[PDB]
Amino acid sequence: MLDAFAKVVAQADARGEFLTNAQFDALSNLVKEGNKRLDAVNRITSNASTIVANAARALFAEQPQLIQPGGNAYTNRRMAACLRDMEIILRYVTYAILAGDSSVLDDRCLNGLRETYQALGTPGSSVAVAIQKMKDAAIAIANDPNGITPGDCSALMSEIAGYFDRAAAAVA
């Protein structure tokens, strides 16, 4: 696993190089933006249960075939596995937000997941819908202007959306 700082170090070590002034500046800027990143992680995590449950309810309303007898989320064991997957994906996305790097999400969650769903018969396209719903809710929560010192988090929200889109593309 790498965070954003370790990523720059790893690239430099492969070249055998000390960091340049521009690289130092870029990492100093990440630190200066760090409070916003902590707020986003806190806000998403603090609302994780409703992000998951609301997205799940909406998926099953739009895709009732998943919950009809014989569908992939029918029976409580399969429903529980589906909710668990949503929680897992959200969890690893929040790890990537804290790290400022997708490696933890790619390595511990997304790699091989498409093949897992294919072996099981789980519709990865429907998982991607659930992920996109969680994305929209998580960004609305993280970027809520109420109750926080005003400032611009647009770059961070674009980064957050990227991690969610990466997960959705990995399963679809």
Binding site: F5, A6, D13, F24, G34, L38, Y95, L98
Partner: protein, 162 residues
């Protein structure tokens, strides 16, 4: 790679848990300390050549036989002098990486893992590298918490060689 952020994530993940406030505080501590760490990393980088050159000579002064004794493990040929300067530069580069990353991970992965095996196989004395590191610590020119940061990772390397 071990940093305060990857350790926080790894703790949550081992427990199957979302990050909690317990972990976000650790990352805030890292972000605040990074001001001093980055000052140290930039200074050591800016003065890297003089520090490396001075450190190599400190080793040769402490251990004069390394300049005269016959053998490829010694600095008694141009090739051996270049290997030694290269190695000292590796140590200093790793210190700057630890400062940038906020932890020991870079030095652990790129230098300390296998260190004992390499020094034994190639007949390189740990004391040589300890002296180079002591010179860097004495002469990096830092003060305040930047010095505390640099010295923490320099002393970590010295401990790894001891």
């Amino acid at each position: 790679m071990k940093t305060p952020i990857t350790e926080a994530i790894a703790a949550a993940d081992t427990q199957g848990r979302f990050l909690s406030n317990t972990e976000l505080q650790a990352v805030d501590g890292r972000f605040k300390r990074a001001v001093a760490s980055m000052e140290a990393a930039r200074a050591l980088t800016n003065n890297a050549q003089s520090l490396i050159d001075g450190a190599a000579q400190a080793v040769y002064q402490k251990f004069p036989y390394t300049t005269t004794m016959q053998g490829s493990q010694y600095a008694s040929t141009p090739e051996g002098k270049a290997k030694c300067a290269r190695d000292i530069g590796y140590y200093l580069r790793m210190v700057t990486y630890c400062l940038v990353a906020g932890g020991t991970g870079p030095m652990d992965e790129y230098l300390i893992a296998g260190l004992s095996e390499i020094n034994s196989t190639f007949d390189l004395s740990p004391s040589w590298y300890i002296e180079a590191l002591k010179y860097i610590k004495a002469n990096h020119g830092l003060t305040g918490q930047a010095a505390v940061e640099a010295n923490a990772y320099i002393d970590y390397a010295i401990n790894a060689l001891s």
